[PDB]
Amino acid sequence: KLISVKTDVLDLTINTRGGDVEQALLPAYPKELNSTQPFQLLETSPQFIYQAQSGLTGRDGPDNPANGPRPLYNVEKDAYVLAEGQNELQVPMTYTDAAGNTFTKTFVLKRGDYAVNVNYNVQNAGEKPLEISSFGQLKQSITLPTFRGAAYSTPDEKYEKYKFDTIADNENLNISSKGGWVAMLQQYFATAWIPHNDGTNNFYTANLGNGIAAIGYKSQPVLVQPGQTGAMNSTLWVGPEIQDKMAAVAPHLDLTVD
Ligand SMILES: [Ca+2]
Ligand SMILES: [Ca+2]
Ligand SMILES: [Ca+2]
Ligand SMILES: [Ca+2]
Ligand SMILES: [Ca+2]
Numbered sequence: 486k487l488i489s490v491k492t493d494v495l496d497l498t499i500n501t502r503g504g505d506v507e508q509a510l511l512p513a514y515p516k517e518l519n520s521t522q523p524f525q526l527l528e529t530s531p532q533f534i535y536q537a538q539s540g541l542t543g544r545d546g547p548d549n550p551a552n553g554p555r556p557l558y559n560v561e562k563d564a565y566v567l568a569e570g571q572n573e574l575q576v577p578m579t580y581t582d583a584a585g586n587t588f589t590k591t592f593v594l595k596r597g598d599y600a601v602n603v604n605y606n607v608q609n610a611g612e613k614p615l616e617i618s619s620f621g622q623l624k625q626s627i628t629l630p631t632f633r634g635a636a637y638s639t640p641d642e643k644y645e646k647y648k649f650d651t652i653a654d655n656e657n658l659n660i661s662s663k664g665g666w667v668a669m670l671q672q673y674f675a676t677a678w679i680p681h682n683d684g685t686n687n688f689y690t691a692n693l694g695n696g697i698a699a700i701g702y703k704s705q706p707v708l709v710q711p712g713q714t715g716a717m718n719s720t721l722w723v724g725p726e727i728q729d730k731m732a733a734v735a736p737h738l739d740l741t742v743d
Contacts (some may be wrong), residue, residue, distance in 0.1 A: 488560060490576050492567040492594045495601070495723070496523065501578060503548060503555035504590045504603075506537040509723050511599075511674075526674055526723055532630040534697060535669075536623075537676055537721050539603055540590075543618035543706040547580060547588055556580035558590060572596050585610040599724030600734050607715040614708040619717040621678030622701030623669045624693060627653055631672055635700040636741055637688050639665040644740045646670075647690055652698040658690040667700045668741045674725055675741035679734055680704050681718040 487507065490497040498508035509527035516522040528535050540548025540555070547556040558578035567574040576592040586609055593602035609615045623635070627649045635647040639662035647658055667688050668677035680686050684705030691699045709715035720734050726742035 486563065488563050488565065488576070490565045490574070490592060490594065492574055492598075493596055494599060495594060497527075497592075497594075497601075498529075499576070499592070501558045501560055503538070503540055504558060504578060504592075505539065506721070506723070509537070511724055514725065524674075526676065530630075533626050535625040535676075537678070537723065538620075538622040538624060538701075539678070539719065539721070540620060541588060541605060541607070541617050541717070542620050542703060543616050545586075545615040546617050546619075547582060548620070553583075556582075556588060567594065567596060586615065598730060599722060599727060600730055601721045601723060603719050603721055605717040607709045607717070609709045609711055609713055609715070612711055614710050615715075616706045616708055617715065617717070618704045618706045619680065619682075619719055620701055620703045621667075621680070621719055621721065622699050623667065623676050623678065624697055624699040625669055627696045627698050633671045635667065635669050635690060635698070637665065637667045637700065638735070638737050638740070639688070640736070643737050647700065649698050652690050652692050653696075655692050657692065658688060658700070660689075661685050661687045664736070665702070666735045666738060667702055668722075668738075669700060670741055673742060675722060677722040677735075677738060677741060678702055679720040679722065679738065681720065682707075 496510035507529040510523040514524035542549045574594045580588045589606040666679040687703045731738040
C-alpha cells in the first residue's frame, strides 16, 4: 500500500513494497508562476515517472530481486504528519524474511528540512553472516510530458554532470569512491542520494528501457554476524537549494542548483 508522510515543507507518498518515494510535493513552492498549487518534484503517473528508490541489496538484501519479491514492510499507520510540538517525524517500517531476520527501514524528516534521512537496521537471526549493501536510485523519464539531467560528486572529482542523452545512448557511469553523492537536476530543484558510510561506494547510471534513465549508488557490502544488528544510513535530498542544510549533508551538494 501507499502511505502519506507530511511535514511543513514536504508531502511524500511512499510505497511500503520496498519503501520507494513515488510522489513528492513541495507545499511551499508554486507549481507554476502565480499558481497556489504545490510544486511536484517526484511523480508517478501514466505520462511521467520520477521516483526516489532505495533499499538493501547485496547477497542477502531483501531488495535484491534474486532474494524474492521487494519486501512488503509493515507500518504502524497509513498517514504520518509532523505534530505541532515536534521537530522530527519518524516513519519506521519493518520486514521479516523467511529465515526470521528483521529489516527496519526508517525515514526521518525534520521541520523545514528537505533532507530526508533513510536509515536501516538489520537484525541477523540466522546462522550465516548476512552480506548487505544499501542502494539509492533516482529514475526519471528522459523526455518530459537550466541543465536537466544527472550529476555526481566524489572527493576527487567534486562535480560532474552526466547527460540523459549519454544514458539513452547506453554509455553509462560505473565509478567507485569513498564518500560522494548522485543527483538529478533541473532549474531550482534537485534530488540526490547521499550515502553515509566508511566504505567504497559504487555510483552508476542505467538506461532502464522505455525512455527511463537512472542514477544511483550501491554501498560496499557489510557483514552482519549471527545474532548481531547492523545499521546503514543515507540521505535523500528532495527540494530547492538550502546552502546551510546541504553543506552539513555532503560536500558540494550545493553545486546541484548552485
Ligand atoms: Ca533466489
Ligand atoms: Ca537468497
Ligand atoms: Ca577527471
Ligand atoms: Ca567535473
Ligand atoms: Ca568532465
